[PDB]
Design an enzyme around this catalytic site. Structure first.
Site, PDB file in Angstrom:
ATOM      1  N   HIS A  40      48.669  36.938  33.675  1.00 58.41           N
ATOM      2  CA  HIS A  40      48.045  38.192  33.236  1.00 58.41           C
ATOM      3  C   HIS A  40      46.961  38.692  34.208  1.00 58.41           C
ATOM      4  CE1 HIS A  40      44.053  37.146  31.455  1.00 58.41           C
ATOM      5  NE2 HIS A  40      44.593  35.957  31.263  1.00 58.41           N
ATOM      6  N   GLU A  52      32.069  30.147  46.138  1.00 56.81           N
ATOM      7  CA  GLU A  52      31.155  31.098  45.509  1.00 56.81           C
ATOM      8  C   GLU A  52      30.259  30.436  44.474  1.00 56.81           C
ATOM      9  OE1 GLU A  52      30.424  34.066  46.163  1.00 56.81           O
ATOM     10  OE2 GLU A  52      32.141  35.293  46.744  1.00 56.81           O
ATOM     11  N   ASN A  54      26.829  32.753  43.294  1.00 56.51           N
ATOM     12  CA  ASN A  54      26.543  34.143  42.951  1.00 56.51           C
ATOM     13  C   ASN A  54      27.567  35.047  43.634  1.00 56.51           C
ATOM     14  OD1 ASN A  54      25.506  36.842  42.824  1.00 56.51           O
ATOM     15  ND2 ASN A  54      23.494  35.987  42.294  1.00 56.51           N
ATOM     16  N   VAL A  57      26.219  37.947  46.027  1.00 53.56           N
ATOM     17  CA  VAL A  57      25.346  37.593  47.143  1.00 53.56           C
ATOM     18  C   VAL A  57      26.061  36.623  48.067  1.00 53.56           C
ATOM     19  CG1 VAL A  57      23.159  36.518  47.835  1.00 53.56           C
ATOM     20  CG2 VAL A  57      23.290  37.818  45.688  1.00 53.56           C
ATOM     21  N   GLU A  62      30.696  30.508  51.399  1.00 57.09           N
ATOM     22  CA  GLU A  62      31.901  31.237  51.032  1.00 57.09           C
ATOM     23  C   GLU A  62      32.974  31.195  52.111  1.00 57.09           C
ATOM     24  OE1 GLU A  62      28.858  32.683  51.123  1.00 57.09           O
ATOM     25  OE2 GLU A  62      28.394  33.525  49.150  1.00 57.09           O
ATOM     26  N   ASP A  84      51.923  31.804  30.884  1.00 59.90           N
ATOM     27  CA  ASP A  84      50.856  32.557  31.542  1.00 59.90           C
ATOM     28  C   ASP A  84      50.298  31.790  32.736  1.00 59.90           C
ATOM     29  OD1 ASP A  84      49.014  34.524  32.115  1.00 59.90           O
ATOM     30  OD2 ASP A  84      47.713  34.074  30.393  1.00 59.90           O
ATOM     31  N   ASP A 171      32.892  29.411  24.059  1.00 65.53           N
ATOM     32  CA  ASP A 171      34.248  29.838  24.410  1.00 65.53           C
ATOM     33  C   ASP A 171      34.289  30.433  25.819  1.00 65.53           C
ATOM     34  OD1 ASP A 171      36.984  30.320  23.961  1.00 65.53           O
ATOM     35  OD2 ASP A 171      36.637  31.760  22.343  1.00 65.53           O
ATOM     36  N   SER A 172      35.497  30.578  26.355  1.00 62.53           N
ATOM     37  CA  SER A 172      35.729  31.419  27.524  1.00 62.53           C
ATOM     38  C   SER A 172      35.875  32.863  27.042  1.00 62.53           C
ATOM     39  CB  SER A 172      36.978  30.972  28.291  1.00 62.53           C
ATOM     40  OG  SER A 172      38.106  30.888  27.438  1.00 62.53           O
ATOM     41  N   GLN A 174      36.022  37.449  28.525  1.00 63.70           N
ATOM     42  CA  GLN A 174      36.571  38.396  29.502  1.00 63.70           C
ATOM     43  C   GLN A 174      36.024  38.107  30.889  1.00 63.70           C
ATOM     44  OE1 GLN A 174      34.682  40.445  26.724  1.00 63.70           O
ATOM     45  NE2 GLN A 174      36.443  39.707  25.521  1.00 63.70           N
ATOM     46  N   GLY A 175      36.905  38.046  31.886  1.00 64.11           N
ATOM     47  CA  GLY A 175      36.500  37.739  33.260  1.00 64.11           C
ATOM     48  C   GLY A 175      36.620  36.265  33.615  1.00 64.11           C
ATOM     49  N   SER A 177      39.350  34.739  32.619  1.00 69.21           N
ATOM     50  CA  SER A 177      40.806  34.718  32.757  1.00 69.21           C
ATOM     51  C   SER A 177      41.268  34.081  34.048  1.00 69.21           C
ATOM     52  CB  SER A 177      41.338  36.147  32.747  1.00 69.21           C
ATOM     53  OG  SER A 177      41.309  36.681  31.443  1.00 69.21           O
ATOM     54  N   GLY A 178      42.259  33.193  33.948  1.00 66.50           N
ATOM     55  CA  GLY A 178      42.870  32.564  35.113  1.00 66.50           C
ATOM     56  C   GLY A 178      42.134  31.351  35.655  1.00 66.50           C
TER      57      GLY A 178
HETATM   58  N1  LIG Z   1      39.140  32.981  25.370  1.00 70.09           N
HETATM   59  C1  LIG Z   1      39.733  34.193  25.925  1.00 70.09           C
HETATM   60  C2  LIG Z   1      39.449  34.275  27.425  1.00 70.09           C
HETATM   61  C3  LIG Z   1      40.524  35.058  28.173  1.00 70.09           C
HETATM   62  C4  LIG Z   1      40.297  36.561  28.094  1.00 70.09           C
HETATM   63  C5  LIG Z   1      40.394  37.040  26.653  1.00 70.09           C
HETATM   64  C6  LIG Z   1      39.132  36.728  25.870  1.00 70.09           C
HETATM   65  C7  LIG Z   1      39.195  35.389  25.131  1.00 70.09           C
HETATM   66 CA   LIG Z   2      28.416  34.541  46.987  1.00 69.28          CA
END
Ligand SMILES: NC1CCCCCC1
Ligand SMILES: [Ca+2]
Length: 223
Positions: A40, A52, A54, A57, A62, A84, A171-172, A174-175, A177-178
């Site tokens: 996705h 990486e 920051n 910056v 890097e 996925d 939790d994880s 948005q952002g 992802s992957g």
């Molecule tokens: N735990 C998920 C992380 C992936 C992106 C959707 C939000 C929730």
């Molecule tokens: Ca950096």
């Protein structure tokens, strides 16, 4: 990452940022020339950013390397999110060192109760929006298949697992992802999906990497 902590600069040396003018997804370096991410996260014009902390910056460790090719899993279904997973090859091999390092693929699947490290540059709020810039970390246990299926009726396939806390708060998001889910030094999961972030009875869902090791190796061997 919601309810996590600041990892520390370059303490997660396999963590990559995928950049298309901006950070949009995490990934995991699995050898000098290949990254594993979520299907996705697929898009064109990817630059892989290694070493990486920051992401806004240039701090001195890097390596920025453009992707030469992306390979989404042949059976990825964008509606159900089954399979996925995607592979990204770098135009040139990364220079591996203590701060830019590959993570081992699993030789066996991880069990419910195993503690894992989840990391990324995603949203740190469960309601609002705030992006941290430095890498965030979360320790979380893999949940049982039955509790995962009970949390998301009709949605959990054999290629998915839940990790986190049914009480919510961690939790994880948005952002993230992957990005990686690493348990006992092996890449067992990829940040895939969930219903919101850190919500009660809605733990994060992750791609079950151990199911894909054969595909990953054969794909790398021929590309
Ligand atoms: N735990 C998920 C992380 C992936 C992106 C959707 C939000 C929730
Ligand atoms: Ca950096």
């Amino acid at each position: 990452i919601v309810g996590g902590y600041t990892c520390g600069a370059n303490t997660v040396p396999y963590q990559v940022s995928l950049n298309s003018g901006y950070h949009f997804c995490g990934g995991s370096l699995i050898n000098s020339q290949w990254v594993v991410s979520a299907a996705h996260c697929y898009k064109s014009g990817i630059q892989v950013r290694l070493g990486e902390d920051n992401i806004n910056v240039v701090e001195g460790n890097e390596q920025f390397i453009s992707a030469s090719k992306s390979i989404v899993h042949p059976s990825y279904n964008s509606n159900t999110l089954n399979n996925d997973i995607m592979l990204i090859k770098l135009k040139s091999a990364a220079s591996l060192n203590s701060r830019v390092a590959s993570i081992s693929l699993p030789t066996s699947c991880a069990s419910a109760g195993t503690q894992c490290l989840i990391s990324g540059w995603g949203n740190t709020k469960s309601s609002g929006t705030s992006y941290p810039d430095v890498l965030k970390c979360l320790k979380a246990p893999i949940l049982s298949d039955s509790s995962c299926k009970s949390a998301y009726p009709g949605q959990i396939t054999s290629n998915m697992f839940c990790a986190g806390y049914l009480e919510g708060g961690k939790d994880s998001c948005q952002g993230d992802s992957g990005g990686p889910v690493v348990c006992s030094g092996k890449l067992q999961g990829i940040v895939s999906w969930g219903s919101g972030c850190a919500q009660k009875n809605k733990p994060g869902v992750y791609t079950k990497v151990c199911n894909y090791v054969s595909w990953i190796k054969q794909t790398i061997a021929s590309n």
